[PDB]
Write a protein that binds this ligand. Structure first.
Ligand SMILES: Nc1ncnc2c1ncn2[C@@H]1O[C@H](COP(=O)(O)OP(=O)(O)OP(=O)(O)O)[C@@H](O)[C@H]1O
Ligand SMILES: Nc1ncnc2c1ncn2[C@@H]1O[C@H](COP(=O)(O)OP(=O)(O)OP(=O)(O)O)[C@@H](O)[C@H]1O
Ligand SMILES: Nc1ncnc2c1ncn2[C@@H]1O[C@H](COP(=O)(O)OP(=O)(O)OP(=O)(O)O)[C@@H](O)[C@H]1O
Ligand SMILES: [Mg+2]
Ligand SMILES: [Mg+2]
Lengths: 268, 555, 474
């Protein structure tokens, strides 16, 4: 526990709970004076003109007559859109996820600089938009915020920016078996990296992948499989447009993961 | 305005009960007998938050959905010239009263199960005539009982936080309301609002407000901002005593236009004994709690009871509720605290033996220790009455369905200013119990040279002649569980174990030696009693009140 | 075998608290002072599921967080080869103990705040001596103390079934462990006959060997014997006082009435001890007309009835409850001998300080008349006894014991003199009030107006009422 800090992000985050549980780290430091102690003395002085005269015209002072500091505990973070001044307590689950991700990133970058931070993220595509999944994919696979993570997902849009990544596929042939593959895009594919990532990220979630060479093959084969076996993609089939040149990268990525690759091609 | 009656038909454990009420009602009984389900019958009738969910299948009697649930409440409205609450009721139900001098009102609840959708619908109806009830008008989620009745349900299981979260907007209700009486404070309550504005410029908050926004704007550079606010305020027994003053303060401020009904369920949970005495004084002496229904297991909440209505739920053959209007008279008011401290533990029993003093308590507690030591577990109780107040205890225990047994003595009391005359005391008490009048005084010719010991045997022979003269009244006392002694307790004890009383005290007259000091020599007798002496006391025919107290059919 | 002592050195409410303990002990007191932090000190020591979460900042005294939390439990293992629980302790402890001290055991808890990860870690040690305590060995999440103690916590009829299910699992599954029960407030939502049944089951049966019981009701102490009473005081500095409550073999026929009188007087602050019910009638009338909230502030009136005052004063003095005694001087005739009298009220006062009983006096009375003049001859003899023994009477005034010169009725005649002549209409109102005590006192207080109660209350013969109210002149 002196070396490893593990941050686990479930799909059912609650912003209130996380903030409350972590509020022991933030807002609980002495820090000397912070050059504003007379402002804190004006906090103390204006509380000395409210506790002796709370009676209005002697209606609640007389109600109390007949029977005779550290207030950071209930602080609530809100999200304010610009141009509006109101504070609605009801907020949707898209920004409430990403504020919890920002609070975990702030607590990793401030409180746990002495340790090794490991993220365990279960399904981060839930209640997010497509462009937020692409922005989270770029921040996961490019920046140095998440140095060590273990990611589980169901969405191809989080694999649009993947590089230098171990891909693990859990499947069943006779028992539960996991096949792994180390993923790198080469220097010769560095100009066409985004198109291969957008093609391959949907074909990673299949069982049998047919690698075709253009869109006319997709038109003819989608007509033939529309008329013969119309539930072919329910059962794990996929048609992958290569682009004519890229047969090594797709076949080694799909063959190391246990996915059956089928190639139909011409003699050029 | 006064509560008068309730009638519950087909409600869970209740089949048909008809219980008279008052403004102040105290509910008591055994465990799992229907004290919670009696309080929910007023929640389903008068509170909208329980009524808006409807009835399930389990709210019917013996899970039988063919029969119908009906809950009818009776109000007396004869104090229209003096009460403001009667004018609060009449201004809503204007058209449905049936005459210009009708002082009765009926608020009814009907229900009938639907088997296809599996739902119990609650239909509310009111009228001055029970045959001609009409439906309560309303629009949407609000009917017309909600403008007149406010029900405050007090349970000690809830904390101050769930009421305090409603109090966060009730502070805003205070600042807006009361015809701007806090408008003198409202410009400088904004000074207290801006005390919460320069808590936002410490640098531990101002660093968070910048760094969370700078961490958030690395995703898509969205047009957002992150702000922080707290909005707190300052003021398991002191939280509860704070919440009692919070409920009384909210009833004084908000609900001046509404009739407030308190449903206080088990208020002795995590309170001290002196706090129970203080809560009893607040509930029965102060005029803050005008109407309440209260369930309790503790006798210290009934130490100050007066002008109240005691409801006792019991089970002889069915779940049946007895009901008694408790008042203390003006002649009894000098000893009222001793009456309530004696009677409030005897209310929670099944068979109560009314004895005179502590010597009877010493002898009967050692005899009931030797014979039937679990008599307190089954519902037996020994009540010290002082020999003076027999009507009050017998009326209170007899109206609640508790079996009262009286064991007493045949005493003669000397008068004031006249020599030689005497008053029958025990015969007058036991004949004022049956409703008959008091008897005339009797004079005994005792000369001045006969004093000391022999005056007591002449008075004992006159007590024997008086007990022989009124034999049919003594048989009427034995018909009504009243046990009048011929002379005293000590002569019956000499009839029971008098060989052992001659053995222990060593004198030839052990009756006189124990009556020389009735509280010192009783312990000296009963420390030396064996097991066979206590069974000879218990199986004697002069001590059949103990056999009536234990409840067995041995005698 | 037996718990001897607990020492809470630093916790939430406690600054330095040292309580003597026993098996079968009951803790009571005022609201909002302690006594569930007493039960949390035992859950943090012996229950694993409370211990596994550590200590927060709010578990330290006044949020000071630079001190060390230390909770030490002392166990007495003096009885060997008689109880199985001592062998259950010694077969797990191994040899941390020493053969020089083969009688005492210390199980200690220490905690220091980390103040970087913001976590108070709980380190448990055990040993035979208080210095040189070694650590309890553990392999994973399992300690060596978890094989010894099983802790069953009860917090609320379905609750009697919840008692019986836990009792059935304790008598079926837990024969090899020491079972410690912590019962916190069992009287809530429970009828009082079931409270007396639970008190009989708690204090008579042998299925509850070790319990710590927290309560607010007097009906759970109706059957108490061989217990230890811990009272937490009402002050802001937490003081706990403990008493080993035992009932003697001589008080066996009195014990039900004794426990039913004392168990309501345990929940007070000032207890006035009186003899009979006519004292309760007169004092409740005078306290109704003068100081009507005395039960709210901690006063109590206790009836004794002639059991020599020792049991109540020892139990109330060991717990820190102030005891005031009001009594009368009476002579008791002897058994089988003529003309001799025991000085019973003076001996009953003299056994409280701790003395010998005085020698009995005798007076010669002829055959004459015995209706009236025998009482004034005995009253003159009582006046000569009260004039003789003035230094012991001033020693009783050094305590809170108030002995009357003759009776309560002569002090009441000395307080109000014209009012008892106006009400009773007699040449002597003392002798008419002495005829029927339970009837004529009711007739006196029915006709007693206001400011006669102030003349009773402000008198020098009734300073026990001013002690029971607690108003201080200087
Ligand atoms: N009473 C109101 N007045 C004005 N704006 C409001 C009010 N209540 C909610 N809003 C705004 O409406 C939005 C509520 O988000 P909502 O859950 O409706 O969106 P969504 O598109 O379903 O989100 P998500 O993608 O996270 O599921 C927020 O911008 C909130 O500020
Ligand atoms: N639908 C029903 N049909 C028949 N009996 C029912 C039904 N619903 C509840 N009961 C009975 O009513 C009981 C409810 O007890 P309740 O809580 O009303 O008693 P109580 O006097 O408040 O108890 P306690 O003193 O333990 O709080 C159940 O135990 C059951 O015997
Ligand atoms: N760390 C702490 N430092 C100082 N005081 C504390 C601390 N923790 C708790 N307290 C005080 O101790 C109190 C705890 O009360 P507690 O629950 O122990 O009382 P109680 O006698 O069991 O109550 P009741 O009779 O109402 O059930 C708090 O209200 C607070 O005043
Ligand atoms: Mg209940
Ligand atoms: Mg408590």
């Amino acid at each position: 526990d002196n070396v490893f800090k593990v941050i686990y992000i479930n799909p059912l985050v609650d912003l209130d709970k996380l903030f409350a549980q972590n509020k022991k780290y933030i807002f609980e430091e002495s820090q000397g004076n912070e050059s504003d102690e007379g402002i804190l003395n004006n906090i103390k002085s204006l509380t000395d003109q409210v506790n002796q005269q709370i009676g209005e015209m002697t209606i609640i002072k007389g109600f109390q007559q007949e029977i005779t500091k550290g207030f950071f505990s209930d602080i609530i973070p809100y999200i304010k859109k610009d141009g509006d001044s109101n504070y609605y307590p009801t907020s949707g689950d898209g920004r409430r996820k990403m504020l919890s991700y920002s609070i975990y990133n702030y607590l990793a970058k401030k409180k746990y600089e002495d340790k090794i931070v490991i993220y365990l993220i279960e399904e981060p595509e839930i209640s997010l938009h497509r462009s937020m999944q692409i922005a989270l994919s770029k921040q996961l696979f490019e920046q140095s915020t998440y140095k060590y993570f273990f990611l589980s997902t169901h969405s191809p849009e989080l694999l649009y920016e993947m590089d230098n990544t171990r891909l693990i596929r859990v499947h069943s042939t006779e028992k539960v078996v996991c096949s792994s593959h180390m993923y790198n895009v080469e220097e010769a594919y560095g100009s066409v990296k985004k198109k291969l990532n957008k093609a391959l990220s949907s074909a990673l979630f299949a069982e049998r992948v047919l690698l075709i060479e253009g869109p006319s093959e997709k038109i003819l084969f989608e007509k033939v499989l529309d008329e013969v076996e119309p539930e072919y993609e329910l059962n794990g089939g996929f048609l992958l447009e290569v682009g004519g040149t890229y047969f090594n990268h797709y076949v080694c990525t799909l063959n190391d993961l246990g996915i059956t690759h089928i190639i139909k091609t011409d003699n050029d | 305005m006064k509560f008068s009656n309730i009638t519950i038909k087909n409600f869970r454990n209740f089949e048909k009960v008809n219980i008279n009420l008052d403004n102040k009602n105290v509910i008591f009984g055994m465990n799992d007998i229907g004290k919670t389900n009696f309080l929910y019958a007023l929640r389903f009738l008068l509170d909208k938050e329980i009524r808006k969910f409807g009835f399930n299948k389990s709210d019917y009697h013996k899970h039988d959905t063919s029969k119908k649930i009906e809950i009818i409440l009776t109000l007396d409205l004869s104090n229209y010239e003096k009460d403001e609450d009667t004018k609060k009721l009449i201004s809503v139900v204007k058209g449905a009263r049936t005459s210009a001098n009708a002082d009765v009102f009926y608020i009814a609840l009907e229900s009938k199960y639907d088997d296809k959708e599996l739902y119990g619908n609650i239909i509310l109806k009111w009228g001055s005539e029970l045959d001609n009830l009409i439906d309560i008008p309303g629009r949407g989620n609000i009917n017309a009982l909600d403008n007149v009745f406010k029900v405050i349900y007090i349970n000690p299981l809830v904390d101050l936080d769930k009421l305090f979260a409603q109090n966060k907007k009730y502070i805003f209700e205070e600042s807006q309301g009361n015809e701007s009486d806090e408008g003198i404070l409202n410009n400088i309550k904004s000074l207290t609002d801006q005390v919460n504005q320069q808590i936002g410029e410490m640098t531990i908050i101002k660093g968070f407000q910048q760094e969370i926004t700078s961490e958030y704007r690395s995703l898509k550079k969205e047009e957002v901002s992150i702000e922080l606010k707290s909005e707190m305020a300052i003021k398991d027994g002191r939280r509860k005593m704070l919440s009692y003053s919070i409920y009384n303060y909210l009833a004084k401020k908000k609900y001046e236009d509404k009739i407030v009904i308190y449903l206080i369920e088990e208020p002795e949970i995590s309170l001290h004994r002196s706090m129970q005495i203080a809560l009893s004084k607040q509930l029965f002496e102060q005029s803050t709690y005008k109407y309440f229904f209260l369930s309790t297991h503790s006798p210290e909440l009934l130490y100050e009871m007066d002008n109240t209505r005691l409801i006792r739920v019991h089970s002889t053959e069915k779940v049946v509720c007895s009901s008694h209007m408790y008042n203390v008279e003006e002649a009894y008011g000098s000893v009222k605290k001793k009456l309530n401290k004696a009677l409030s533990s005897a209310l929670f029993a099944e068979r109560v033996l009314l004895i005179e003093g502590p010597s009877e308590k010493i002898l009967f507690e050692k005899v009931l220790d030797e014979v039937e030591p679990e008599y307190e577990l089954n519902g037996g109780f020994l009540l010290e009455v002082g020999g003076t107040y027999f009507n009050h205890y017998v009326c209170t225990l007899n109206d609640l369905g508790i079996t009262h047994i009286i064991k007493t003595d045949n005493d003669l009391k000397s008068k004031k200013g006249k020599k030689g005359v005497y008053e029958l005391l025990g015969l007058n008490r036991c004949l004022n119990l049956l409703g008959r009048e008091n008897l005339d005084e009797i004079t005994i010719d005792i000369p001045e040279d006969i004093k000391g010991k022999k005056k007591k045997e002449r008075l004992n022979e006159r007590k024997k002649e008086i007990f022989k003269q009124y034999k049919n009244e003594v048989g009427e006392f034995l018909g009504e569980r009243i046990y009048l002694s011929e002379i005293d307790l000590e002569n019956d004890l000499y009839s029971a174990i008098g060989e052992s009383m001659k053995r222990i005290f060593e004198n030839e007259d052990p009756v006189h030696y124990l009556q020389k000091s009735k509280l010192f020599n009783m312990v000296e007798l009963v420390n030396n009693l064996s097991t066979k002496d206590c069974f000879d006391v218990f199986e004697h025919e002069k001590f059949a009140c103990l056999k009536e107290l234990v409840g067995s059919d041995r005698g």
